[PDB]
Design a protein around this nucleic acid. Structure first.
Ligand SMILES: NCCC[C@H](N)CC(=O)NCCC[C@H](N)CC(=O)NCCC[C@H](N)CC(=O)N[C@@H]1[C@H](O)[C@@H](OC(N)=O)[C@@H](CO)O[C@H]1NC1=N[C@@H]2C(=O)NC[C@@H](O)[C@H]2N1
Lengths: 63, 60, 77
RNA sequence: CCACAAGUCGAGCAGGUACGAAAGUAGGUCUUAGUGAUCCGGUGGUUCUGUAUGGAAGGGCCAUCGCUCAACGGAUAAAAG
RNA sequence: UUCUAACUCUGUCCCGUGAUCCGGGACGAGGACCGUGUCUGGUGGGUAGUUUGACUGGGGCGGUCUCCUCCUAAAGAGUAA
RNA sequence: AUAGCACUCUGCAAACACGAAAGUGGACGUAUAGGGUGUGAUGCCUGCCCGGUGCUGGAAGGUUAAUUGAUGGGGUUAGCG
RNA sequence: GAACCCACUGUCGUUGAAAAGCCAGGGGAUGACUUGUGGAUAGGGGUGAAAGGCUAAUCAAGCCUGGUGAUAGCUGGUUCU
RNA sequence: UAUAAUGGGUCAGCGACUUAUAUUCAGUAGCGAGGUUAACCGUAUAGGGGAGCCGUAGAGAAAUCGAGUCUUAAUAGGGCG
RNA sequence: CUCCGGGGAGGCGGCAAAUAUCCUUUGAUCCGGAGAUGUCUGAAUGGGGGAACCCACCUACUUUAAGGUAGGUAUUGCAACAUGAAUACAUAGUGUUGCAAGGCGAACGAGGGGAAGUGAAACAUCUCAGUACCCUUAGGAAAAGAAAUCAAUUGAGAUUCC
């Protein structure tokens, strides 16, 4: 039958022009003890690593 | 339930009064023994329409 | 069997659901019981197996109407 | 520095500020340990969204809170012989 | 505390009836109790599904499991018990 | 296993057991009877402990379920602006 | 102490005459005895003077058919140049 | 592994990477900024059927903009293009 | 076995030859259509029963001896008629006649109940799956069906299938 998207991964990754973008970990809680530099540098999106791109493609065949 | 008393009752009322009683009282004592009737529209039409005077002078 | 003569109610199936969301089969049963009703037009008592909703319907419509309706469906009262 | 997820150092630019007469110094503490992903929720903001329309509920974004998850990359909310 | 009319009787009598089932009728003893349905707290190895870590000079017992400093480490980095 | 012994439950529609129920065994028996438990002819005997777990009887103080729903806080808009 | 019912010791037998026996001895033998015929109890059930014994040479959950081609991070195998 | 580690007494016959759908990459053919129909109709591999799909634009959670866009007080810087 | 139609030189079924008696152009065998007969068991239905068996009753006709022929005798539901308690009217109950049903069989339909192995690399929420299985009951199909339905330029217009 049709390939089925892994919905959990679909909720974590979005496609860019030449790859996939993602959010960064360690910003959900326990934030008081973290320095300001880490607070402002873990904010925003980054790219999925080339070593994980293939797994992302198998998990999300249509995005 | 709502009933019209066909014949005199000690505390409910006399000869045609409409009273509300607990459902079991009317269902098991009044209605089967002919001491009251359900207060529906047809039964009311029956009670005041024709047999009212008959129930009246059958006081005893 | 446990069938109400007036309404046709019968036991139904459902689930017991625990706090951990374990589900087990169960049955919901009607509030069935026997009751004698005075039929004046026939000068006799008729014994019915019915529910409390059946009693409420009988209170609403009169025993004669209910008995005639049940006879019209082939119930031998 | 590093499989990933992470971690580390950083000149310099803009705004506001403190101490100096001034050139200036300051983005915690001589440094290297003092720690916990994701999910689910709570709180403060918000020019985002709002299932007919106007609202609202709910959701999103920014900030932050709750684990001796110590078997410390944490198989369940929940388990001995 | 009384009462009877719902309801109970694996109590007596009559009839269906050639019948210790059942049904109807008449009494008697009880009686708004007992008992049943829905909801709800407690109890519940009676029964059912399962769980009960890894490293390890075999396994068990003991110890250990994450982070920092020194040596092993062979004058860059890294390097095991 | 046993005759014998002891504890305990059971007032009869008995306790207890089978069954979903109807019903059936107990028993066409009635506390000198019936069920469960332990001990094991007979002789001599069978001491101390009620803190724990269980059972039995109290008590009506604290805690707690469904049900009930007093108050308080928001959403919406006639209107006022 | 014969029949009958058992099964304490020993040799033999162990691809047996026999998927539990023969032979020589042994225990009970008017009783809680042995036995024929026909019935009842059906699988988390039955029955058990209780060995987890027995329930068709099968029992810590009988047999048959279905789910079913159960799953197996395990073992084996995988064919001409 | 000659191994005294496994498997095979021998021969003949049978015996194990398949099928359907979706997707990605390579080769090849048609057409080419375009390519292609599905169900269905159809004396039926033709011819019709353009609904739909892929490509031609990205940024942002989103509203929104768009060869730009997001972040920001910033036209600075920086990320994706 | 009978009738009608077809056909025109052989036939008496097969294993399965062989023989005897035979049949057939006055039409055989064979083929098609329509009738007749059709033992016993089995829903089995007069009662019973270890299926293919045992035992019966009533009515009519017939025999002279210990029989024969024909018909009737199940249950339940419905209807009509008759009869009829406790109990006075009635009712329950009882009987006769007439009509109908039961059982079997592929798949598909509708409805009543309803797992676990397995996957989650453990497992309880979840999955497997309303699947397997059990039960009831139709039709040539069944079910559904003519909006107290969708839509969101105020538009579409019953159900079913791709
Ligand atoms: C009161 C009450 O609760 N009502 C609930 C209704 C449930 C049921 N759905 C009713 C229904 O509509 N149809 C079924 C009626 C049966 C119902 N269960 C009661 C009943 O009669 N049981 C008997 C019983 O099993 C058994 O008798 C004895 N003596 O043991 C035997 C008869 O001898 O078989 C049944 N009888 C049979 N007659 C049938 C027949 O002729 N063909 C087919 C098959 O149905 C046969 N079975």
């Amino acid at each position: 039958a049709k390939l089925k998207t892994r919905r959990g991964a679909a909720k974590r990754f979005k496609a860019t022009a030449n790859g996939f973008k993602r959010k960064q970990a360690f910003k959900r809680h326990i934030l008081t003890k973290k320095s300001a530099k880490r607070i402002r540098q873990l904010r925003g999106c980054v790219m999925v690593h080339v070593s994980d791109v293939a797994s992302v493609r198998r998990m999300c065949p249509y995005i | 339930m709502d009933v019209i008393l066909l014949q005199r009752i000690k505390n409910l009322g006399k000869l045609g009064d409409k009273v509300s009683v607990k459902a079991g009282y009317g269902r098991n004592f009044l209605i089967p023994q002919g001491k009251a009737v359900a207060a529906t529209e047809a039964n009311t039409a029956a009670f005041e329409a024709r047999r009212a005077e008959l129930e009246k002078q059958e006081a005893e | 069997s446990k069938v109400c003569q007036v309404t046709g109610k019968r036991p139904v199936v459902g689930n017991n659901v625990s706090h951990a969301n374990n589900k087990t089969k169960r049955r919901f049963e009607p509030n069935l019981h026997h009751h004698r009703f005075w039929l004046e037009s026939e000068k006799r008592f008729v014994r019915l197996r019915l529910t409390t909703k059946g009693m409420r319907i009988i209170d609403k419509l009169g025993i004669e109407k209910v008995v005639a309706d049940l006879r019209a469906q082939g119930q031998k009262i």
